[PDB]
Amino acid sequence: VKQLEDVVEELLSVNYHLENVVARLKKLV
Amino acid sequence: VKQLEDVVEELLSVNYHLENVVARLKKLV
Amino acid sequence: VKQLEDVVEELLSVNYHLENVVARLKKLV
Amino acid sequence: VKQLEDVVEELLSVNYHLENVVARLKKLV
Ligand code: NA
Numbered sequence A, B, C, D: 001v002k003q004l005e006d007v008v009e010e011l012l013s014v015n016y017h018l019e020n021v022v023a024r025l026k027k028l029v
């Protein structure tokens, strides 16, 4: 688990970070 | 543009799809 | 596990699919 | 454009970062 919950942490951040870049793209475009 | 807005469409879907898989992972884990 | 390996499957596909949309964006842009 | 190529930069990094977290998950799991 302890390794798994650290992957989950990094996935949460990657996912938030993609959603902010996609919102920025969508108003650029 | 017309090519750009189709990339934006696919990014929106990829991003939603990642958020649902991450929510599922986070309650599995 | 069986639930975990199905999340892993979906993540693999989401990740491939993002890499193809990013390659397409990068040559559009 | 200059705004677009900065989105592209951030997408490249998000995509690399997801692929490393997915590779780590897949060998955890
Ligand atoms: Na932590």
Ligand code: NA
Residues within 6 Å of the ligand: A020, A021, D010
């Ligand atoms: Na940003």
Ligand code: NA
Residues within 6 Å of the ligand: B009
């Ligand atoms: Na459409």
Ligand code: NA
Residues within 6 Å of the ligand: B020, B021, C010
């Ligand atoms: Na799903």
Ligand code: NA
Residues within 6 Å of the ligand: C009
């Ligand atoms: Na399968």
Ligand code: NA
Residues within 6 Å of the ligand: B010, C020, C021
């Ligand atoms: Na595509």
Ligand code: NA
Residues within 6 Å of the ligand: D009
């Ligand atoms: Na730069």
Ligand code: NA
Residues within 6 Å of the ligand: A010, D020, D021
């Ligand atoms: Na990492």
